[PDB]
Design an enzyme around this catalytic site. Sequence first.
Site, mmCIF file in Angstrom:
data_model
loop_
_atom_site.group_PDB
_atom_site.id
_atom_site.type_symbol
_atom_site.label_atom_id
_atom_site.label_comp_id
_atom_site.label_asym_id
_atom_site.label_seq_id
_atom_site.Cartn_x
_atom_site.Cartn_y
_atom_site.Cartn_z
ATOM 1 N N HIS A 102 32.329 -8.826 -31.762
ATOM 2 C CA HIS A 102 32.215 -8.431 -30.346
ATOM 3 C C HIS A 102 31.661 -7.012 -30.130
ATOM 4 O O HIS A 102 31.182 -6.694 -29.038
ATOM 5 C CB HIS A 102 33.510 -8.674 -29.531
ATOM 6 C CG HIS A 102 34.495 -7.535 -29.549
ATOM 7 N ND1 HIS A 102 35.638 -7.548 -30.323
ATOM 8 C CD2 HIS A 102 34.540 -6.381 -28.837
ATOM 9 C CE1 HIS A 102 36.330 -6.440 -30.107
ATOM 10 N NE2 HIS A 102 35.679 -5.710 -29.218
ATOM 11 N N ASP A 147 35.981 -13.417 -34.532
ATOM 12 C CA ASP A 147 35.547 -12.060 -34.191
ATOM 13 C C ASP A 147 35.391 -11.257 -35.469
ATOM 14 O O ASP A 147 36.266 -10.463 -35.831
ATOM 15 C CB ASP A 147 36.549 -11.356 -33.286
ATOM 16 C CG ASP A 147 35.974 -10.109 -32.656
ATOM 17 O OD1 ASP A 147 34.765 -9.839 -32.847
ATOM 18 O OD2 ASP A 147 36.706 -9.408 -31.943
ATOM 19 N N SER A 186 38.291 -1.156 -31.604
ATOM 20 C CA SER A 186 37.731 -2.463 -31.963
ATOM 21 C C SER A 186 36.819 -2.405 -33.185
ATOM 22 O O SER A 186 36.038 -1.461 -33.317
ATOM 23 C CB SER A 186 36.941 -3.029 -30.790
ATOM 24 O OG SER A 186 37.790 -3.333 -29.693
ATOM 25 N N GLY A 187 36.935 -3.408 -34.072
ATOM 26 C CA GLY A 187 36.122 -3.474 -35.295
ATOM 27 C C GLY A 187 36.772 -2.739 -36.460
ATOM 28 O O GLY A 187 36.410 -2.966 -37.621
#
Lengths: 52, 234
Positions: free
Chosen positions: B42, B88, B185-186
């Site tokens: 994402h 994801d 995120s990530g």
Amino acid sequence: RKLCSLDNGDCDQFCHEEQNSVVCSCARGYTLADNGKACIPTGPYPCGKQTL
Amino acid sequence: IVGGQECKDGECPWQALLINEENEGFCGGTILSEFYILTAAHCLYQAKRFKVRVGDRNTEQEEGGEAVHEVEVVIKHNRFTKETYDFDIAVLRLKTPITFRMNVAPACLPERDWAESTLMTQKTGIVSGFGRTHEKGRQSTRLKMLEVPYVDRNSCKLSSSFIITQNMFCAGYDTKQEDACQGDSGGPHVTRFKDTYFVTGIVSWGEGCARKGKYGIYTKVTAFLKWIDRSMKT
Ligand SMILES: O=C1[C@@H](NS(=O)(=O)c2ccc3cc(Cl)ccc3c2)CCN1c1ccc2c(c1F)CCNC2
Ligand SMILES: [Ca+2]
Ligand SMILES: [Mg+2]
């Protein structure tokens, strides 16, 4: 609790049950020590170790 | 990261930061090897062109360990779904190899069965990043880490207004004000075992940050071990 269920089978890292006995192994960049349990880094900056 | 602590010298060496054209972090990543970075699929829609920075703990000072790497290949999971964030996950191949040093080192990839039986059953994992320090705040100039408890799968499903797929797990707290947040995120979710840190998750999504009765939702890295290995061979 038996083999890998009992304290990770005494392995430093990965524990597998081949037959009815514990087999230890290590992430890439480590070699299994002579006692067949400990994981020794092959080179500098092995994965998973905080630096210094 | 809401709450938690600063990563001290050498403590979070596997942290990577995805930086946009203006050199601003927009997502995290995890160093897997000299050539590969693990991140969230994402994150690849949040910037047109980006680079990866490693060896950085303070975006306001040069510490001597910082290195920027250009991306040669983006390997996104083809089953990634934007509506649910299922699958994801993405791997990045860098143009030049990361030179490991103080504050720059990879996290270990575990084996699936062992990780699920032995790492995911530990009390806690560790999430890290340069993300927001509160839901409506700005991004941290300091790299932070946070011990996050593994959360019972059923309790997590009950708490979620959105589907929790087989490719996700939950971590964090019911009401305590600690969680990952925007910009994390990530990033890495690692689990410590006998002083060795194994990557166990990817910061994926949350219904806000640190909200009551809500948990952090992470990509279940153990479900993607074969996929990661394939992505890292080309
Ligand atoms: O991820 C976030 C929130 N964005 S955030 O930047 O605040 C954020 C991003 C990633 C997080 C990861 C964790 Cl582990 C915890 C909090 C997070 C918070 C806003 C709403 N939201 C969100 C909520 C529900 C769903 C998704 C969301 F992105 C995607 C999949 N479908 C369900
Ligand atoms: Ca810096
Ligand atoms: Mg909560």
